[PDB]
């Protein structure tokens, strides 16, 4: 729980952990040992931060740190995803988010379907995995595609090019999955492709064999990357509904016991918490069991089923 204060960029850093904690508690049904309506104050501060973010609105129906500064594509996608994930507690602006989605699709995207950013964010802590300038373009495209698919459930009646942009991005990233070096980008690209269902065959090989030790997508520094990639894997498996590899990685997750804290350890925490929330929501208490047991007797004509 951190008080939301600062500029447009700083408000996200201030109020993101409270938002992720509130959603995780809501989905996990573990509110009984958190404070007995501390959610009231948490959501009041969240609404205050939402009003502060709205105060820096731009004519393009997007959001940014400065009123005069052009919005960033990654920042717009992150804001859209965060506001779309919170559509069950408080009222959220509908037309503004749809306009931001249309601006991202029609303007901040090449005709081939590749999204390109022009204004990098001021702060260097919330960038996450984009610090290394090796595969920035396709990583940005995948993140934008994920945010757009997350927001697809509402703004479809206001955007008509969204299915076309999604198809273009998926068909373009299908052929680029074999030319990736860093591991966590491989994981996130696999998750993005599996979101629609374009992760099958040799791609899974790169998810299984190319990964180091089949469970850790480690990189020099930024340990959170690992769990981030971990979460991606779970989501992909949860999209494919496979129980072969999920329990071991879930058990490995609990051995870390990380709850944020540090320099720019916010985006990864949000992604892992939302992945865990989806995991809890989708995974049943058991595995599928539906038997249809019949028997036949040489003395009875009917089949007893």
């Amino acid at each position: 729980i951190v008080t939301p204060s600062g500029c447009g960029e700083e408000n996200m850093i201030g109020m993101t952990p409270t938002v992720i904690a509130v959603h995780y508690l809501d989905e996990t049904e573990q509110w009984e040992k958190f404070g007995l309506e501390k959610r009231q104050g948490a959501l009041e501060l969240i609404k205050k931060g939402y009003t502060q973010q709205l105060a820096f609105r731009q004519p393009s129906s997007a959001f940014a740190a400065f009123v005069k500064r052009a919005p960033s594509t990654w920042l717009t996608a992150y804001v859209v995803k965060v506001f779309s994930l919170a559509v069950n507690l408080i009222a959220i602006d509908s037309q503004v988010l749809c306009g931001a989605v249309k601006w991202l699709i029609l303007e901040k995207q090449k005709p081939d379907g590749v999204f390109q950013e022009d204004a990098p964010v001021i702060h260097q802590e919330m960038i996450g995995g984009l610090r290394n300038n090796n595969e920035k373009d396709m990583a940005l495209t995948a993140f934008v595609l994920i945010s757009l698919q997350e927001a697809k459930d509402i703004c479809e009646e206001q955007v008509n090019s969204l299915p076309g942009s999604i198809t273009k991005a998926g068909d373009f990233l299908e052929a680029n999955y074999m030319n990736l070096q860093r591991s966590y980008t491989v994981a996130i690209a696999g998750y993005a492709l599996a979101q629609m269902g374009r992760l099958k065959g040799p791609l899974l090989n790169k998810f299984l064999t190319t990964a180091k030790d089949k469970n850790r997508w480690e990189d020099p520094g930024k340990q959170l990357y690992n769990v981030e990639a971990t979460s991606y894997a779970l989501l992909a498996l949860l999209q494919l509904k496979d129980f072969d590899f999920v329990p071991p990685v879930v058990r490995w997750l609990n051995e870390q016991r990380y709850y944020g804290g540090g320099y720019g350890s916010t985006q990864a925490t949000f992604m892992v918490f939302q992945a865990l929330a989806q995991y809890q929501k989708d995974a049943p208490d058991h595995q599928e069991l539906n038997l249809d047991v019949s028997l036949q007797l040489p003395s009875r004509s009917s089949k007893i089923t």
Binding site: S301, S302, K303, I304, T305
Partner: protein, 274 residues
């Protein structure tokens, strides 16, 4: 193996409303989970009704022992009230002196996405219709033909009526080989009244050439009273939106329509017959 009678299309990814084995020689049945019977020498009626927010998708009855009689000569299963797409139907099945047992499973799908467009279309509808039978054409005029292996009935001249797996089917009027299938439309239960109409595009590449209708309807008797489906006006090139009205003696439960388009069509199709 057993005699399997089908209403609707089976789906492998859905759940069953219930499943019970019924002794057809019992008088009366056992009320399982709260559903009533009516058993006679010639009839077996199940007044099933569910208490879940879902709509019936299919019904399958398996009769024992297997008796070598074709199922397409007449009709055996039908929901007298309601039917497929509703939450309950009065399911009537006619028995025989040899059949002594039955096994009834009924499937339902969530009422939210209560649609059948994903199962009656198949992969390629261009050559295969909803019945799963291939299309046959004649070289006399390069058009379609007629099938004579299922249950059919006629009332007036040039009237087509087909009944298979609880599906009632009609074609107006005939289809050419070179025509390209465009799309399809569905009608839910909430949009169904005693009389209703449709509006379809008839401009540029969307010129109407051939239409087909598949539906599920109720019966008050073993012999049904077919709805009086007739086209109103002329689907000419001038009127941009063509319309079609339906007059029903018995209330319908589901409706599916497929659209066939050909810009080169003249808007009229009829053989040189009188």
């Amino acid at each position: 193996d057993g005699d399997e009678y089908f209403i609707g299309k089976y789906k492998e990814k859905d759940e069953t409303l219930f499943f019970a084995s019924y002794g057809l020689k019992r008088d009366p049945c056992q009320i399982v989970l709260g559903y009533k019977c009516s058993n006679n020498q010639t009839h077996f009626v199940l007044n099933f009704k569910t208490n879940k927010k879902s709509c019936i998708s299919a019904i399958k009855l398996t009769s024992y022992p297997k008796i070598n009689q074709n199922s397409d000569l007449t009709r055996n299963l039908y929901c007298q009230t309601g039917g497929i797409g509703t939450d309950n139907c009065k399911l009537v099945f006619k028995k025989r002196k040899r059949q002594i047992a039955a096994n009834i499973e009924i499937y339902g799908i969530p009422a939210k996405k209560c649609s059948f467009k994903d199962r009656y279309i198949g992969a390629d509808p261009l050559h295969v219709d909803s019945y799963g039978l291939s299309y046959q054409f004649d070289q006399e005029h390069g058009w379609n033909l007629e099938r004579n292996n299922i249950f059919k009935d006629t009332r007036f001249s040039t009237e087509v009526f087909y009944h298979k797996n609880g599906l009632f089917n009609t074609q107006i009027t005939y289809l050419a080989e070179e025509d390209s299938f465009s799309e399809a439309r569905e009608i839910t239960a909430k949009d169904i009244k005693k009389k209703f109409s449709i509006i379809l595009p008839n401009e540029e590449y969307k010129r109407i050439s051939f239409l087909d209708v598949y539906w599920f309807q109720e019966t008050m008797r073993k012999k049904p009273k077919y709805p009086y489906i007739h086209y109103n006006g002329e689907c000419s090139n001038e009127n941009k939106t063509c319309e079609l009205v339906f007059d029903t003696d018995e209330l319908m439960t589901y409706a599916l329509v497929k659209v066939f388009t050909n810009p080169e069509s003249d808007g009229s199709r009829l053989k040189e017959e009188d």
